[PDB]
């Protein structure tokens, strides 16, 4: 439980940088823009997670279906094993049934 | 986001302060102090 004996360097974080000032600026692009673009298109990230949300099993299933043809050998094997384990646990284990 | 306890020193000391006047290892070891302090209370 030994704790450090010196003051850590105080992080000089500013609230008025470019990212913090323009955070989510076009969140209402559709509503205020005569609908052409959903707020889905502003999400940057993995291809299988743009404008989508699910639990671990659904996320693994979607990843395997979408980008499973470009995964490495061990990555695909790990994804398959994780899918199998999640299927078994979710469909056969738990309390509330 | 990995979270770890940083005030464990004070958490241990809050119990160890009530066992300073004991005899044996009960005044030093936290495992033997929590049981002795509860019996004391």
């Amino acid at each position: 439980f030994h704790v450090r004996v010196t003051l850590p360097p105080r992080k000089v974080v500013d609230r008025w940088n470019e990212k913090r000032a323009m955070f989510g600026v076009y969140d209402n692009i559709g509503i205020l823009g005569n609908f052409e673009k959903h707020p889905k298109e502003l999400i940057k990230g993995p291809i299988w997670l743009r404008g989508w949300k699910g639990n671990e099993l659904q996320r693994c299933i979607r990843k395997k279906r979408m980008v499973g043809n470009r995964m490495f050998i061990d990555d695909l094997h790990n994804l398959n094993k994780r899918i199998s384990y999640l299927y078994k646990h979710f469909n056969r284990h738990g309390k509330y049934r | 986001l990995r979270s770890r306890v940083t005030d464990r020193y004070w958490r241990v000391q809050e119990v160890l302060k009530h066992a300073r006047h004991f005899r044996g290892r009960k005044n030093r070891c936290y495992r033997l102090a929590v049981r002795a302090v509860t019996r004391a209370f």
């Binding site: 704790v3 450090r4 004996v5 010196t6 003051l7 850590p8 105080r10 | 770890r4 940083t6 005030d7 020193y9 004070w10």
Partner: peptide, 26 residues
């Protein structure tokens, strides 16, 4: 390395207490 400032500040207070107890100022 544990991220945080509260623990460091609290231990600084503890160190000041120990120093005062060891060497009582006139």
């Amino acid at each position: 390395a544990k991220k945080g400032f509260r623990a460091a500040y609290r231990f600084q207070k503890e160190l000041e207490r120990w120093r005062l107890l060891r060497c009582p100022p006139p």
